[PDB]
Design a protein around this ligand. Structure first.
Ligand SMILES: CCCCCCCCCCCCCCCCCC(=O)OC[C@H](COP(=O)([O-])OC[C@H](O)COP(=O)([O-])OC[C@H](COC(=O)CCCCCCCCCCCCCCCCC)OC(=O)CCCCCCCCCCCCCCCCC)OC(=O)CCCCCCCCCCCCCCCCC
Ligand SMILES: CCCCCCCCCCCCCCCCCC(=O)OC[C@H](COP(=O)([O-])OCC[N+](C)(C)C)OC(=O)CCCCCCCCCCCCCCCCC
Ligand SMILES: CCCCCCCCCCCCCCCCCC(=O)OC[C@H](COP(=O)([O-])OCC[N+](C)(C)C)OC(=O)CCCCCCCCCCCCCCCCC
Ligand SMILES: CCCCCCCCCCCCCCCCCC(=O)OC[C@H](COP(=O)(O)OCCN)OC(=O)CCCCCCCCCCCCCCCCC
Ligand SMILES: CCCCCCCCCCCCCCCCCC(=O)OC[C@H](COP(=O)(O)OCCN)OC(=O)CCCCCCCCCCCCCCCCC
Ligand SMILES: CCCCCCCCCCCCCCCCCC(=O)OC[C@H](COP(=O)(O)OCCN)OC(=O)CCCCCCCCCCCCCCCCC
Lengths: 87, 128, 13, 155, 177, 459, 99, 558
């Protein structure tokens, strides 16, 4: 039960979610692709992506942090903060 | 149109349905900025003592000390006997005492009258 | 592997 | 702690109100006391009676369980509005509408049980018949007296 | 309303939070996933109908009756995540989150049970105590007159220094002890 | 009783001739030996009380209060020795001397054959208690309590003195043994009404009565730990002992003079228990709990049935042990966090598991968990007051809800929840503190096995 | 907008320190350094010796006292044989059969 | 004789021996939960022999073995009543507790306070078998308050969480309000009958027994979560899953029902007490089953299930059928403990997920859990010749054919339909359909502890009604003659509930979004009863506890 999360695992799962998203092409998506400026998404799309992260990992990101996560690396770093990875 | 939410004493109005939350005026900017400033200053004054290694003890909170001193000490020296204080200290002070007095006196007079008339079933009542 | 230290108060006394 | 951070009497002049609002660590515009009827609150700030359950949970609190900060002037009934106790939070249904639905439901169920007790349902049978004079010696009848004959007949 | 950094909510933040709460309460209303996904694109269309509204007073009013719409259509018991506040597993392990200073109160017979751990904890505490006065004198020259305006703290500027007010954030207990 | 008074007095040369590092050990040892000696008072009989001399006697009412009194001194010496460590040695010996003198006054207050010797020792117990509270109370702010002590002297002990001198002139004696056989009925008259108030109001304030309890959440707060232990454990019970002696002479006028004060207690335990739900101060909460439990003893003495006296003396012994342990737990947190605020230090079961076990056990005895003698006393008083009036069970049972409510709240606030972050001086439990909690609780639990020795003279 | 460069720098520095702390919460292969310290004995210690104790208690201290163990007398039917007497209970009346 | 009383006391002393073991410890344990589970298994085996030699002859007795106190006419002795109720409840309680502890060795394995958990659970078992075997009111009050306090300590197990402490204090509050009536009954029997012993109460047989029976009905209201004092049993799902499984479904919450079944010679000669029990039980079994229709936490739904079954137990006491009510207790223990165990197996498999709106697709993922959940739901609803058929249907077969409050019967039938509704609601949202849980599947159940622990209660939930109802003697006359529309009542109403709730469940796949109705808002916010009274009655206390009590009178005037 309760498997350990790794930055490889969190990275691969966040990118696995974003590669199943029909406004992000899977060939331009990188680990530092900014949502508004580099992938060209809306703040509505950004809220849908953070809600997809909540659907993915089974917890909630609050809105004061959901309004600032603007790359997949910030998502991986935030889940690393809230899950204590690489003990 | 829609049912308007009714606030209550135990059901407060939400932050979203209050109109004054949607104030955009600069005086609300000043009030919110001064509240953020006082809160940030008190937060900093707290966590400089909290994160200090040389302190090992209790970060004393003068708002908490002030709250306990208000709940204990400040009750008598700011009392003024007037109509409101005397009537409210006579309602909940000698009201229910008189109430339970007449209730228990009535029931005990009834029970005594039934016992001295041979009415109350006191058959197996030998523990008392 | 990857055993983690559990911080707890002193159960000695 | 010393005296000039302790509570005092009711603020009458506005400069005493300003000295108290500096003492209680809040804005002078928000600082209102309890009204000086003589009930002994003193110069304590009348906070607007919000339960601590209502607060922001994700906010970085000094007291996370209380949802309270250091130096913040607490509510007068802060022992009462903890999350183990009295809540004032908003509800999906209105307060009076809840009281009306509960009272109508409870009183109507009481009235329907009174109606069903008024009109009881049963079986198309006679009474249950027991031998030996309605079981006289079994039900605690004395052996010296003899009751009336309780005789049942075939049908 | 009540936030650590900003003293208010911007209108953009209010729109995004109302959209998120509407989708969450909708998913509570609309349990199945394809059904919620259909109504979710319908609600995304309803939110993108007036995305390009320039008038901030008209957008304020539209947001206000959108809050009335959301309050009229809310679920009574929405889905709260278990470790989210209001959840069933929320703050469950807080009785297991012992603060770190209690390790200082151990007896030396059980401190000797973990020699490498406390031998490293000594230099952790050494690091903290030679970082403290440097980060205090960092904060005293950057804070404006009247105290700091916002609750956010500056980072470590020099190389070799540590960020100010860092020990309880770094040495906080794990969420699953 | 002179095999107990003389060792208690020999504790004075034992405490003044002891070496400076040995004065706690010697007094604790010899007071524990006196407490072991104190079990010879259990030579009670089903008809006769144990009558030692012309001056001292012991029935089954005075005997358990004597054993509790002689047991309370070592516990007070353990509880009060930490916060007197930086004290002067001579002042420390003065503290121990005032404790020994208070025990000396109490153990011949409870055995007083004659009632004016009871009055002299009864009002003699106030002076070492006064000096202990005001010389070692760590802060003294008594602007309203001076006028209340004046009210205690006016409405209390002085009419008792005039009334006892009047009985001395009328009956010719104040021997309780003689007054068992020479008691006249006290009929309905105004002279006998002021006679009843004079015989009762001193002990009404000593219990305390509701409305007259204004001193007790002050004198418990402004005191050291030994003072609060002896106030909760013994010095309230002098009022109940004196009522159970003096209500022999007050028949049958008590049968209609009890009706106001019974109301004052039956509603009063509804209020003070409710007051415990809104206490910021933990020590004040335990004080109002003591008022809420002594209200039942007031009712049980005033209704004067056998079951009520049995329940009242069992409740007195049980509440003495329980509330003394509650004040000791309150001090075992106050010596760490240096404030009595109950919302300051929370979540202490995360830090002190065995001490939270002691908090749990003292709370369960506080809310009368059966078969503890708290519940036996509570229950027998409730049965007797049901025989008094069948409606009072409501005012009993509602109290028995609120008595549970603040008992676990005191457990939930102090021990459960999230720990307070900015408090880092929470040390582990000293063996002294756990020994103090066990020497409270384990006698209280063993008395559930054999409760017949704490059910008074008419068991 | 996201974070400032100051906030990203602070989160990166705090994240490095946090990962160092969490990695340094690990254990050594010697840790914990501990100090230097019959198939059915359960049914003997927990059952059989308590059955001995409780049988001694009930046989020689409880039933030797009056009315301590009171038992409902056994249910007597027509046709039974009494062991204390030797008396055979007669049967019931012959049945007025229904079927 | 010498076998019966000896093994009777050996069971209770054997249950107390691991408490001495955990209190006399110095080492770290060689699997103390296995030791307690082995002890309770052997205590089950020990208590089987007095039950079998009760089924042989009907042998009941009293063990008044230790004289404790004599208050002048009241000889309080340590007195154990071994009757039909103890002989059927003790093996069922020990069997259920043995399955709960083999469950807990899997479920509570991550808890570092596992020895404290098994200690507290054994303390609960000891206090409960003190309750159900007591011969006087005082020892029964000991066990009564004991299961109340162990309920407190096992609700507030995660004592850092605010909601767990809140629910535990709530449960203590409602139970002490029931204790007002229990102490009222003790007071009445001591004054008017000079006894707390059951034998002198039953032999004197008072006629003016309305007031002690009102006290006992208030005690069962506080204890069995009847209407007015009910919401602590849904609040008490904040504790761990084996706590809610053992205590608050099957063992503790039947003790108010057991208190009223224990006093059946007083209720059978008081029609007013029967009518009040019938009305209160029908009100509770309506209300809690109606609240169960619109909930989404699975522990809440199964707690409303067990409180509706307790209301049905109160109904069948109220028709003067106490032995059918106690057969329903012994029956209900098996499948309701198994339903909580299977729900918690889903919860632990789905990483602490309890909300049914994020479940589904577990028919083939958790096959044994799905099998046992379907068997537990069908035993709950009254599937023919499962265990829940052998009591509950008979309850309806005596609720129709008796001099009954008609509206109480109609609400009993509406409750019988609602049981089928929420049972197939659980099977719909949790087992059927397509998955709704998050993406990292850690679904697993292949531990012999979990599988054997659900397996033995599965054997119970299949065979135990047949075995017990063919091993218990008649104490009433079973009413077996009724018309065919009246014999087929409970089955048809249950199948109508299944059909109505399947139509409700197949209206959820439709792509429509309706505004919430007032019935949905009423039943989802729990009849508005925990929303108002949990705010209003504290408020009117605590302001009155501060303004007038502390500040006005007892700091200024007096
Ligand atoms: C004369 C000879 C008599 C011999 C028999 C003994 C008679 C009773 C004596 C006293 C019994 C209690 C002793 C232990 C409690 C105090 C210390 C403590 O907390 O230890 C924890 C510790 C175990 O915990 P831990 O994990 O090691 O550390 C603590 C944890 O960190 C944190 O702790 P935790 O939270 O994990 O666990 C705490 C837990 C918490 O559990 C609870 O709170 C649950 C308790 C309430 C519900 C269950 C009980 C309900 C009532 C029914 C049972 C009683 C009647 C039964 C009779 C039949 C039915 C009528 O408490 C217990 O487990 C205690 C078990 C006993 C409880 C008794 C009832 C207390 C409730 C309040 C009063 C109720 C009415 C009065 C009862 C009187 C009984 C005689 O125990 C020990 O280390 C034991 C120390 C030695 C004990 C000696 C006992 C005898 C002392 C008397 C000496 C003189 C006579 C010589 C006899 C010597 C015999 C060896
Ligand atoms: C407590 C509140 C009441 C205290 C009253 C003062 C102490 C009285 C002690 C008893 C004295 C006594 O024997 O009273 C009967 C005596 C009766 O007088 P007597 O006993 O000398 O008369 C001979 C006997 N008879 C009555 C049959 C004729 O009462 C008094 O003399 C006056 C009693 C009241 C005292 C008034 C002054 C004090 C007022 C209250 C202050 C507080
Ligand atoms: C491993 C432990 C077991 C011990 C192993 C070593 C010894 C070997 C076994 C043999 C033991 C010795 C012989 C048997 C014991 C002695 C028998 C005997 O006559 O003893 C005298 C008496 C019997 O009572 P009695 O009737 O003779 O006298 C009572 C005393 N008077 C008359 C003054 C009131 O005492 C005992 O037996 C004590 C043991 C009792 C067991 C139960 C204790 C429960 C405690 C609960 C406290 C609270 C109660 C609340 C509830 C009350 C009711 C509602
Ligand atoms: C068969 C006959 C049936 C008769 C029925 C009619 C009689 C009974 C009437 C109902 C009485 C009980 C209901 C009212 C009190 C309920 C109090 C309670 O349970 O409070 C719970 C509350 C927390 O509840 P909740 O909001 O769910 O919390 C989770 C999220 N916050 O917790 C809190 O807020 C904490 C509050 C702590 C202080 C409590 C103060 C109130 C005390 C109430 C005592 C009531 C005594 C009644 C005595 C009756 C005597 C006859
Ligand atoms: C304040 C602090 C907190 C509270 C603590 C208690 C303080 C008060 C203590 C006393 C309580 C009230 C007095 C006792 C009441 C007992 C019954 C009684 O006296 O009834 C009132 C009386 C009825 O007349 P009756 O009793 O027949 O008088 C003839 C007597 N042979 O009525 C009358 O005779 C009329 C009134 C006459 C005046 C009586 C004054 C003396 C009593 C108070 C002192
Ligand atoms: C027990 C006997 C069960 C079988 C007899 C009752 C059959 C019946 O009326 O079933 C109703 C219904 C099936 O009919 P329906 O769902 O409307 O149509 C689709 C068919 N698969 O629904 C069902 O068959 C499902 C409910 C069956 C309840 C069984 C437990 C009682």
């Amino acid at each position: 039960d309760a498997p350990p999360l790794t930055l490889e695992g969190i990275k691969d799962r966040v990118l696995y979610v974003l590669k199943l998203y029909d406004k992000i092409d899977p060939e331009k998506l990188s680990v530092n692709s900014h949502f508004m400026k580099d992938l060209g998404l809306d703040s509505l799309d950004q809220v849908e992506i953070i809600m997809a992260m909540e659907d993915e990992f089974g917890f909630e990101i609050p809105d004061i942090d959901a309004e600032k996560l603007m790359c997949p690396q910030e998502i991986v770093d935030y889940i690393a903060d809230k899950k204590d990875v690489y003990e | 149109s829609f049912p308007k939410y009714e606030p209550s004493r135990l059901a407060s109005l939400p932050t979203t349905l209050d109109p004054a939350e949607y104030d955009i005026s600069s005086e609300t900017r000043k009030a919110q900025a001064e509240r953020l400033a006082i809160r940030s200053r008190l937060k900093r004054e707290y966590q400089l003592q909290y994160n200090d290694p040389s302190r090992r003890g209790v970060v004393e909170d003068p708002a908490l000390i002030r709250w306990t001193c208000a709940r204990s000490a400040n009750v008598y020296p700011n009392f003024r006997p007037n109509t409101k204080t005397s009537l409210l200290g006579a309602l909940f002070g000698i009201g229910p005492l008189i109430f339970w007095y007449y209730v228990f006196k009535t029931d005990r007079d009834r029970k005594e009258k039934l016992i001295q008339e041979g009415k109350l079933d006191r058959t197996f009542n030998i523990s008392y | 592997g990857k055993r983690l230290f559990i911080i707890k108060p002193s159960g000695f006394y | 702690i010393t005296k000039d951070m302790l509570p005092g009497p009711y603020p009458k002049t506005p400069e005493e109100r300003a000295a108290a609002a500096k003492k209680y660590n809040m804005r002078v515009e928000d600082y209102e006391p309890y009204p000086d009827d003589g009930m002994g609150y003193g110069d304590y700030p009348k906070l607007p009676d919000r339960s601590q359950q209502e607060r922001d949970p994700w906010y970085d609190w000094d007291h996370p369980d209380l949802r309270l900060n250091w130096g913040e002037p607490m509510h007068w009934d802060l022992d009462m509005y903890i999350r183990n106790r009295v809540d004032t939070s908003p509800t999906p249904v209105n307060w009076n509408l809840m009281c009306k639905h509960l009272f109508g439901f409870v009183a109507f169920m009481l009235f329907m049980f009174w109606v069903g007790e008024t009109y009881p349902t049963y079986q198309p049978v006679g009474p249950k018949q027991y031998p030996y004079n309605n079981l006289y010696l079994e039900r605690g009848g004395d052996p010296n007296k003899e009751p009336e004959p309780v005789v049942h007949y075939e049908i | 309303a009540f936030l650590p950094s900003a003293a208010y909510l911007t209108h953009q933040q209010k729109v995004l939070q109302l959209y998120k709460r509407a989708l969450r309460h909708l998913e509570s209303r609309c349990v199945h996933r394809d059904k919620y996904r259909y109504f979710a694109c319908l609600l995304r269309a309803r939110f993108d109908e007036h995305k390009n509204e320039k008038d901030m007073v008209k957008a304020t009013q539209l947001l206000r009756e959108a809050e009335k719409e959301f309050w009229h259509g809310q679920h009574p018991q929405p889905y709260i995540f278990p470790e989210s506040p209001g959840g069933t597993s929320y703050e469950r392990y807080e009785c297991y989150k012992v603060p770190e200073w209690c390790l200082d109160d151990w007896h030396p017979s059980e401190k000797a049970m973990y020699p490498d751990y406390f031998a490293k904890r000594e230099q952790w505490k050494k690091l903290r105590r030679e970082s403290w006065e440097r980060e205090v004198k960092q904060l005293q020259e950057e804070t404006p007159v009247g105290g700091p305006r916002t609750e956010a703290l500056p980072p470590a500027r020099k190389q070799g220094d540590l960020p100010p007010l860092w020990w309880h954030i770094v040495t906080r207990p794990r969420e699953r002890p | 009783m002179l095999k107990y008074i003389i060792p208690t007095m020999m504790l004075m040369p034992l405490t003044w001739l002891s070496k400076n590092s040995m004065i706690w050990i010697n007094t604790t040892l010899h007071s524990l030996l006196i407490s072991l000696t104190s079990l010879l008072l259990l030579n009670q009989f089903g008809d006769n009380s144990l009558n030692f001399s012309l001056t001292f006697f012991s029935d089954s009412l005075s005997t358990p209060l004597l054993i509790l009194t002689m047991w309370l001194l070592p516990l007070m010496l353990m509880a009060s020795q930490h916060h007197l460590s930086k004290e002067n040695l001579a002042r420390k010996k003065l503290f121990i001397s005032m404790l020994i003198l208070l025990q000396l006054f109490l153990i011949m207050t409870f055995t007083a054959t004659e009632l004016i010797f009871f009055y002299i020792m009864f009002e003699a117990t106030l002076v070492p208690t006064l000096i202990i509270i005001t010389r070692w109370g760590n802060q003294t702010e008594r602007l309203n309590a001076g006028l209340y002590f004046l009210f205690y002297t006016l409405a209390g002990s002085l009419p008792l003195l005039v009334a006892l001198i009047y009985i001395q002139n009328t009956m010719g004696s104040l021997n309780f043994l003689i007054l068992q056989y020479w008691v006249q009925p006290m009929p309905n008259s105004w002279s006998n009404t002021f006679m009843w108030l004079a015989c009762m109001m001193a002990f009404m304030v000593k219990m305390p009565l509701y409305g007259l309890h204004l001193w007790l959440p002050k004198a418990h707060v402004e005191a050291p730990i030994a003072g609060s232990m002896v106030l909760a454990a013994i010095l309230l019970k002098l009022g109940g002992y004196g009522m159970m002696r003096i209500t022999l002479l007050l028949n049958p006028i008590t049968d209609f003079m009890a009706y106001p004060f019974i109301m004052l207690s039956l509603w009063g335990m509804i209020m003070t228990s409710s007051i415990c739900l809104r206490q910021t101060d933990l020590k004040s909460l335990i004080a109002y709990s003591s008022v809420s439990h002594m209200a039942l003893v007031i009712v049980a003495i005033l209704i004067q049935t056998p079951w009520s006296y049995m329940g009242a003396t069992a409740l007195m012994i049980a509440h003495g042990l329980t509330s003394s342990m509650l004040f000791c737990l309150a001090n075992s947190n106050y010596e760490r966090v240096h404030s009595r605020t109950m919302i300051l230090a929370r979540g202490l079961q995360t830090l002190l598991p065995l001490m939270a076990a002691w908090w749990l056990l003292a709370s369960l005895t506080n809310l009368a968990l059966p078969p503890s003698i708290n519940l036996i006393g509570e229950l027998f008083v409730v049965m007797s007051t049901f025989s008094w009036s069948n409606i009072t069970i409501i005012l009993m049972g509602l109290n028995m809800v609120i008595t549970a409510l603040y008992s676990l709240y005191m457990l939930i606030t102090t021990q459960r929840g999230k720990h307070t972050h900015h408090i880092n001086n929470i040390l582990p439990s000293f063996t002294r503190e756990n020994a103090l909690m066990s020497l409270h609780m384990l006698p209280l639990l063993l008395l559930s096995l054999n409760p017949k020795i704490i059910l008074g003279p008419l068991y | 907008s996201g974070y400032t460069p100051d906030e990203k720098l602070r989160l990166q520095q705090l994240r490095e320190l946090r990962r160092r702390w969490l990695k340094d919460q690990e254990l050594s292969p010697r840790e914990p350094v501990l100090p230097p310290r019959r198939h059915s004995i359960f049914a003997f210690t927990h059952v059989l010796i308590p059955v001995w104790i409780i049988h001694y208690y009930l046989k020689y201290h409880v039933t030797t006292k009056p009315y301590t163990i009171v038992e409902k007398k056994p249910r007597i039917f027509p046709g039974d044989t009494i062991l204390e007497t030797g008396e055979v209970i007669p049967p019931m009346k012959e049945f007025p059969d229904q079927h | 004789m010498n076998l019966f009383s000896s093994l009777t006391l050996v069971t209770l002393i054997l249950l107390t021996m691991p408490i001495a073991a955990i209190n006399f410890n110095t080492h770290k344990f060689t699997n103390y939960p296995l030791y307690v589970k082995t002890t309770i298994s052997c205590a089950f085996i020990t208590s089987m022999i007095p039950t079998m030699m009760f089924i042989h002859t009907g042998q009941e007795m009293i063990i008044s073995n230790w004289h404790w106190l004599t208050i002048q006419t009241l000889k309080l002795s340590l007195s154990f009543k071994m009757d039909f109720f103890s002989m059927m409840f003790v093996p069922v309680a020990l069997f259920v507790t043995w399955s709960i502890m083999e469950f807990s060795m899997w479920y509570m394995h991550s808890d570092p306070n596992i020895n404290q958990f098994f200690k507290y659970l054994l303390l609960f078992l000891i206090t409960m078998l003190i309750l159900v075997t007591a011969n006087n009111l005082f020892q029964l009050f000991i066990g009564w308050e004991g299961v109340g306090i162990m309920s407190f300590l096992l609700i507030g197990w995660w004592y850092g969480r605010t909601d767990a402490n809140t629910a535990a204090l709530q449960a203590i509050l409602y139970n002490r309000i029931g204790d007002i009536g229990f102490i009222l009954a003790m007071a009445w029997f001591l004054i008017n009958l000079n006894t707390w012993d059951l034998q002198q109460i039953f032999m004197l047989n008072p006629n003016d027994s309305n007031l002690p029976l009102m006290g006992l009905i208030l005690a069962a209201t506080g204890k069995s979560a009847q209407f007015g004092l009910h919401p602590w049993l849904p609040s008490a799902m904040e504790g761990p899953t084996p706590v809610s499984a053992l205590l608050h479904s099957s063992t503790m919450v039947v003790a108010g029902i057991f208190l009223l079944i224990r006093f059946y010679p007083l209720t059978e000669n008081n029609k007013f007490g029967q009518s009040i029990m019938l009305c209160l039980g029908a009100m509770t079994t309506l209300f809690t089953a109606m609240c169960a229709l619109t909930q989404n936490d699975i522990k809440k739904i199964i707690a409303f299930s067990t409180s509706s079954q307790l209301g049905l137990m109160m109904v069948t006491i109220g028709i003067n059928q106490p032995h059918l009510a106690f057969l329903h207790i012994c029956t209900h223990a098996f499948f309701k403990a198994m339903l909580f165990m299977c729900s918690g197996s889903i919860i632990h498999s789905l990483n602490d997920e309890q909300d049914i709106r994020k479940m589904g697709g577990l028919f083939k993922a958790m096959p044994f859990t799905t099998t046992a959940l379907i068997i537990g739901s069908l035993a709950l609803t009254g599937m023919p010749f499962l265990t829940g058929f052998y009591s509950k249907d008979l309850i309806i077969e005596s609720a129709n054919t008796s001099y009954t409050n008609a509206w109480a019967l109609l609400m009993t039938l509406v409750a019988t339909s609602f049981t089928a509704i929420y049972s197939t609601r659980i099977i719909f949202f949790a087992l059927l359909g397509q998955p709704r849980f998050p993406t990292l599947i850690n679904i697993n159940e292949n531990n012999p502890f979990l599988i054997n622990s659900i397996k033995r209660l599965l054997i119970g939930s299949l065979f135990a009604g047949f075995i017990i109802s063919n091993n218990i003697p008649p104490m009433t006359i079973p009413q077996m003659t009724m018309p065919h529309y009246l014999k087929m009542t409970a089955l048809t109403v249950t199948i109508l509930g299944f059909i109505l709730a399947l139509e409700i469940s197949n209206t959820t796949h439709y792509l429509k979004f309706n505004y919430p109705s007032n019935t949905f808002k009423f039943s989802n916010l729990l009849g508005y009863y925990p929303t108002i009274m949990h705010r209003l009655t504290p408020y009117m206390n605590l302001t009155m506890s501060q303004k007038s009590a502390s500040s006005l009178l007892d700091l200024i005037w007096l």
